């Protein structure tokens, strides 16, 4: 419970940060930007989006160690804290 | 056991869920769409495929944190609960 | 030890699959056949190289949920019990 | 602590190797090299770039199979030998 209120706040800030640096150096839309960011640290990286400048490549190599760990820390915290017990929920008699 | 079969039918119905979703919001071909959508879950992401709609892409962000962790949830389930003991089983005298 | 060494063949034996498997009914070259296989088993899918037949996409569907709890696990004994061992050997006076 | 710092070290070698790597055999200026390793250690893969040549192609083969496990290593220590602590640095009251 509370320990997934706060990776959801660090995710959202992390997530935050990666659309604003993106639409302002790599001049993306804001959604495509929130767009790549998810895409990004979840490792999924389609490609249809990535970094062209110096600056973009080099944000992207330290967005990438920093916030994996993070992103998916909150992934398998809402998997175990919050999709785990529903799924039971629905289960037993 | 009856976890494996609980893991199995969840991921068949976060598959159809994406196969339906990008058939028609992003008019792939169904078998393209669960293809699309395998890709999109375990982070392979090749990107022959990409949503181009924001709809699509509001959607996807969505689709991966609510099923990355499903998916991998029964990969290692049945990495676990089923090719484990049958690579055993081909070893002991 | 022993550990290492199965999973060392299960692995094999898996990218020798998907080596003839893409080189047979996608018509990669057997290096660019193996080359995709692994790149499609560690989820890093760079897209260079993707299936275009449906054939090819249903066997792709089908071998990333088979291979990459084996894949992984070899990598993570691999680090464990080899790479893990020879960083400390370097390491204690 | 001593952990982290073994782990820093051990990353920043396998992205010394791949940077001189890929800018030698693959053209790439360092730091298309070093985005490109960092790229595909992480599994994120875009695509943007990939390599061309046979030798490139071995290389990446063999650098992904040694590479993930030390850089997720690293990832996971530094989210937990060090952010971790710092999150609840500026929780409690
Ligand atoms: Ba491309
Ligand atoms: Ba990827
Ligand atoms: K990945
Ligand atoms: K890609
Ligand atoms: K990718």
Same mark, same amino acid.
Do not use: M, W
């Given at each position: ?8 706040? &660090?995710? $959202?800030?992390? &997530?935050?940060?990666?659309? $604003? ?5 790599? %001049? ?5 930007? #929130? ?20 600056? %973009?490549?080099?944000?992207?190599? &330290?967005?990438?160690?920093?916030? $994996?760990? #993070?992103?998916?820390?909150? $992934? ?7 999709? &785990? ?5 629905? #289960?037993?008699?």
């Amino acid at each position: 419970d509370k320990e997934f209120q706060v990776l959801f706040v &660090l995710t $959202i800030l992390t &997530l935050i940060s990666g659309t $604003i640096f993106y639409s302002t150096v790599e %001049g993306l839309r804001p959604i495509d930007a #929130l767009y790549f960011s998810v895409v990004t640290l979840t490792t999924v990286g389609y490609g249809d989006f990535s970094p062209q400048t110096d600056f %973009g490549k080099i944000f992207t190599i &330290l967005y990438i160690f920093i916030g $994996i760990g #993070l992103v998916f820390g909150f $992934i398998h915290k809402l998997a175990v804290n919050v999709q &785990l017990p529903s799924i039971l929920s629905n #289960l037993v008699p």
